[model samples]
Target: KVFGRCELAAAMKRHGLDNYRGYSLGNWVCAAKFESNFNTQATNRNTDGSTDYGILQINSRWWCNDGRTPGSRNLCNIPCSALLSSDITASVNCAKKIVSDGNGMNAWVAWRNRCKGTDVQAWIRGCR
Candidate 1:
């Protein structure tokens, strides 16, 4: 599913992504924009052969099991396929697990490259 800006924000808020790890709603929005452009079915395979899934780009190497990522720990205890759901709940839960595991939001390069140390307020729904 493709999400409009405010719709994404509202959905994420419902899942408590706002202020998660002290990252603002805009921060999560910016990360999602760069990671998947808010596309629920997004997936990108990494050079190391692990695949990232869903809008938040949860990775097979550590978060989800796709049956092929070699050393996949499946730390989130979820099937990577579940991350592709438009519901986004599994993706959000995995994202939270990633951060809570001491990885921080910078675990995703897209979040580091695009959302960090920037004025991401524009990504906030009403702020836009």
Candidate 2:
């Protein structure tokens, strides 16, 4: 179960999350775990000490800004937030939008072809 989750239905609305029925959020959660173990506070520092932060491991400073609300930067990438709030639909929708606009969860879903003994991580590279 996802941590801090309190009635996923209500939470989804608060975070602006979407495509749950289509499995977009599910794939993102899976990819995030594969990429970073599903820790929202998780951070990675390169040899230069540069960082990747939050659930998606966004380059916090580079992707984040003052004008945006918590996790809004994710909208530019994939806008799903683990947080619970009122605008969950928009947040989740924003994530789907980002994926549609970029590497997209669909590519990741396609990447599941890896399970079928296919190697296609590169297909998701164009997401950015």
Candidate 3:
């Protein structure tokens, strides 16, 4: 499995502006850099037992929607993972939606504030 920052670069190579796939690869790269330094393996754990994982830093609790019943779990529609999949365009679109939905970098900063280390997280938060 692809498990690092270069994976993002690889994705960019396929979906970048040169191909003109109706998405802004430059913007996607900038956001990825903001999120995990482009590192797909980046992870963080909360004392409450919650965890953030992979390049996209997807939080299982926040995103996973699999039902609780046996075999009833909708794993087919599993929450997307930036590190776990090669859908660069999809990842780009996902990030765009999040950044846009939460009001861009300010929302990311708010997220970091809850995680601790405002000073450290500010670098990425400053990215617009």
Candidate 4:
């Protein structure tokens, strides 16, 4: 499921992630853009064979299960496929858990390398 920037921003804001843990919505939006381009079904196979799942690119090593990984923490308590849907509630909830764990958006390497110190406002340019 692919989403437009404004729609994604609006939805995220409604989910209370607009300013979660001091990170702006633009930060998460920018991370999503680099991570999965807002495609919920997006998955990336890492060099270590662990896969990143969903729009936020949550990793299989410590986050969710991709079936291929033998022992995932499954921290979100939801299946990896749950993140790959048009309904983003599960992903958002899991993301909140990740942020609450103290990493904030830094949990995503994309956010660190692509969004951090960069102009992330453009990600929410047309959003309220």
- Estimate the Cα RMSD of every predicted model relative to the unseen true structure: 1.4, 9.7, 8.0, 1.3
Q: lDDT score of model 3?
A: 0.45
Q: Which candidate is the best by TM-score?
A: 1
Per-residue lDDT of candidate 2, residues 7-110 (tens digit)? 43335434644354444333444455454454444556545333454444444333433233434343344322332223234334444544555454543432
Candidate 1: list runs displaced more than 4 Å: 125-128
Please provide, for model 4 over 12-127, each residue's C-alpha lDDT reduced to its tens digit, 9 standing for 90 to 100.
Answer: 98999977888888998888888998899898888877888888888888888778887668888877888888999989999999989876777788889889998888888866
What clash count goes with each model? 0, 15, 1, 0
Point out the worst 10-residue segment of candidate 1 by lDDT. Answer: 119-128
Location of the lowest summed lDDT over 10 successive residues in candidate 3:
66-75
- Each model's lDDT comes to 0.89, 0.41, 0.45, 0.86
- For 1-128, candidate 3 gives per-residue lDDT tens digits of 34244445455555543223333334444445556666655667656555554545554444433232223222224453443454445444444445544454343542444433234333223233
In model 2, what lDDT does residue 18 have? Answer: 37
- TM-scores for every candidate against the unseen true structure: 0.94, 0.42, 0.43, 0.92
What TM-score, to 2 decimals, does candidate 4 have?
Answer: 0.92
